[PDB]
Design a protein around this ligand. Structure first.
Ligand SMILES: [Cu+2]
Ligand SMILES: [Cu+2]
Ligand SMILES: [Cu+2]
Ligand SMILES: [Cu+]
Ligand SMILES: [Cu+]
Ligand SMILES: [Cu+]
Lengths: 336, 337, 336
């Protein structure tokens, strides 16, 4: 497309929402290609990541870890306004794995505190894709400070299975998984700091062990439980988008399955089916589609169970509806 | 199916066998859906995991690590009687990744010492699948104490390749891979504990390093070697089912291949072909089909070679038959330059 | 084939080229099956792997880490003369993952210093495959000392996508990724040793932590950056073969994609498409095909970004040509 052709396309402004929710969108594209406009303000802020009051100096797109999910369709343009307020201390940028050129956009979006930038790219490939900050020389530090999220580029005709039949979800959730590397003092207590730069040297030492202290969904142990448990009903079709910008993960829905899983996150690669546990490499997003068949509590985990249940990588679903005794029944309940 | 319809189905009681062997079964289903009945007794037991005498307080379905492979066909029902004898100290349960609902069955099978339970589920999806114990609040500790195994849900028409051609194995082995996290004393020697509970806190510390001390097949370093090496012959078609309930692995047959590999373990997902090294994520089972073409000794390993050869993740195959010089020949044996 | 038929096949000697470059070959096979002859001399030598003078006693096929890429076609034979000079002090051998029998060749090629051997095997399966030294009882030590490379067994009709359309590359590079485990003294300084064996016990202790001290491409931090960046042009089709003989990796082209990725490395397994980050398990090779669409500097990394930017696993591509503003444009450059 020429500059004039792009200038003539319709514009649509989207209001982002906090994960694990996803902003309003249509699965099947409404009309032809558009320039879809998003704005995010970067917030450097302390977050508390566990019940011991452990702190991270987060670097947070739109104020959350992960950053919010942006949804467009294939061959739309994504036009992001990125703002780094004067209240921040560091330069930031953005690299979209969905984009082509200039280090995913990072080379064109380096903004110091008090600056903003607008980047446009053509979403040429359908899938879920990571985005993350990547300042030269400080790349992993920003990413493991929570400065990452994902986008979804839907096919213009929505999702399909490997044989071209439509797959239409009722609900979508975005689970961003984060590895954190929190320094500890000689007595094993997590250290606190009063500026992001103060934590840098100590954090790099932990990073270099390749052993996270915490592995969490939505920025904290237990974040996607209780008041923030995900919900569904028996019969409901749910898409779970999952990202990890730095480290491998292996998602699993305890009591469920991934009926269709785009484990590589790319919709032109046919989905795996009937999955127990799928695998998403560090630096990628994946997506799983499931139709709930039983009510009750589910856990959704990284199935390194030490990572899930010692380090924090566990969420819950609460599912309403009627129990199916054909699928499962207790013939003899626990008894003497 | 209604309660009355399920009640009318034939029942078949199966006797489990110890890994790496698999109980007798038919690849293609015989007749219509059945309720296939299994029983396992849980044993908390001390096991030795290396030649030095290192001990683990194992938590073992049917007394083995891994637990035994249960085999059914798609749309059969698996009906497990699970018994937690009064000689044990902990509550246990079972989560079948093959099942749908109640945390895989774990929510319906919590049994204290002196209790039993019977769970039935419909095996709706074909593949190999992990099962493991999962007591709320103590999940990884039970799993990395060996309390895991796998099942195989065969398609009713047996296995096929990605293009509808039948794949019929001559024999099947189940390799359960276990990551252990054994505490060490200040000399760097592995610790022993009088009771299983005594090891908990020290073990959790090792677990949090995400670095196992041992990575083993069939419960111990060298367990599938020597007189316990797996066997095959030139021309023989072997299915190797491999599980890892907690941690990633990357199986490889040294001197062979995975001709067809269901790396995700799910038979409706077409297999990869001609594989050198495949990948099974923690929390899953996979399966590889190979026709042997050369005789001799093979090693079957996790191809993180440190894990294989330092930490224990190596098994052997002994293979009979005639050497094939077309496939490989020593043109010049090691000799002076 | 009969004995006389095998004996009648043409024999052809090929001169090897150091990674990341690849020796002369045709994508579509020229003529019928051949016995393709290669020679490699093993070199034990101290190499410096980082900017701080850190040494490894490398064990190097053909003198390089990784060893060179050998290229044949399916149903050719690969006939390797492997030489272990008398100046070396260890026994070595070779295991081809592409080969069938005798532990991939390792059982037939155990050569002490002052010995040579010639192994022939039929390349029955198309793909990229690891090769590595594997002396019984010291396998990981040789491999993580750099004694590994890869081969490519092309289909006789060249590469194809999943729909049977030809994929013809303009150039090919081989990126061998190496995990090193360098001992440190109690002050955290890397240790040096007189002879390879002197380092054995200390190195195995580091290996058993499963935490490399360095993760590098082409044998050193920065070996494929700066003036040793790989090159391409807009419009050029590039195949990037990547291997890791011991440990998982997750390659990613920053600013690009894997348009077609044989993530398992095997050409009869259909390639994934539109990949952001692909996954190659330890003990395997993979290959990615990409058509460059934007000029500039790209980084090519293991997308555990700590591994990439703290431990060494980052390469560059320098790409010439015209910028494409349709694909990406800075609507508003960074500004107040
Ligand atoms: Cu990235
Ligand atoms: Cu599980
Ligand atoms: Cu190998
Ligand atoms: Cu940043
Ligand atoms: Cu248990
Ligand atoms: Cu060697």
């Amino acid at each position: 497309a020429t500059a004039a052709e792009i200038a003539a396309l319709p514009r649509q402004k989207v209001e982002l929402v906090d994960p694990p929710f996803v902003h309003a969108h249509s699965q099947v594209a409404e009309g032809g290609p558009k320039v879809v406009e998003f704005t995010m303000v970067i917030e450097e802020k302390k977050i508390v990541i566990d019940d011991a009051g452990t702190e991270v100096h987060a670097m947070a797109f739109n104020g959350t870890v992960p950053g919010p999910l942006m949804v467009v369709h294939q061959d739309d343009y994504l036009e992001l306004t990125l703002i780094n307020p004067e209240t921040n201390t560091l330069m930031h940028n953005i690299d979209f794995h969905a984009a082509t050129g200039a280090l995913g956009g990072g080379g064109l979006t380096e903004i110091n505190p008090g600056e903003k930038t607008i980047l446009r790219f053509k979403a040429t490939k359908p899938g879920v894709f990571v985005y993350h900050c990547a300042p030269p020389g400080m790349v992993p530090w920003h990413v493991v400070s929570g400065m990452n999220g994902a986008i979804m580029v839907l096919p213009r005709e929505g999702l399909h299975d490997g044989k071209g039949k439509a797959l239409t979800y009722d609900k979508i959730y975005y689970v961003g998984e984060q590895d954190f590397y929190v320094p500890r003092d000689e007595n094993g207590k997590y250290k606190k700091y009063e500026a992001p730069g103060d934590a840098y040297e100590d954090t790099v030492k932990v990073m270099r062990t390749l052993t996270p202290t915490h592995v969490v969904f939505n920025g904290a142990v237990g974040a996607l439980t209780g008041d923030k448990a995900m919900t569904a009903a028996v019969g409901e079709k749910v898409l779970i988008v999952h990202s990890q910008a730095n480290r491998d993960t292996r998602p699993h829905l305890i009591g469920g399955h991934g009926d269709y899983v785009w484990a590589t996150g790319k919709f032109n690669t046919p989905p795996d089916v009937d999955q127990e546990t799928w695998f998403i490499p560090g630096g990628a997003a994946g997506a799983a589609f499931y139709t709930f068949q039983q009510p009750g509590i589910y856990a959704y985990v990284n199935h390194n169970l030490i990572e899930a249940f010692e380090l924090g990588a566990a969420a819950h679903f609460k599912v309403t509806g009627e129990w199916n005794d054909d699928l499962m029944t207790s013939v003899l309940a626990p008894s003497g």
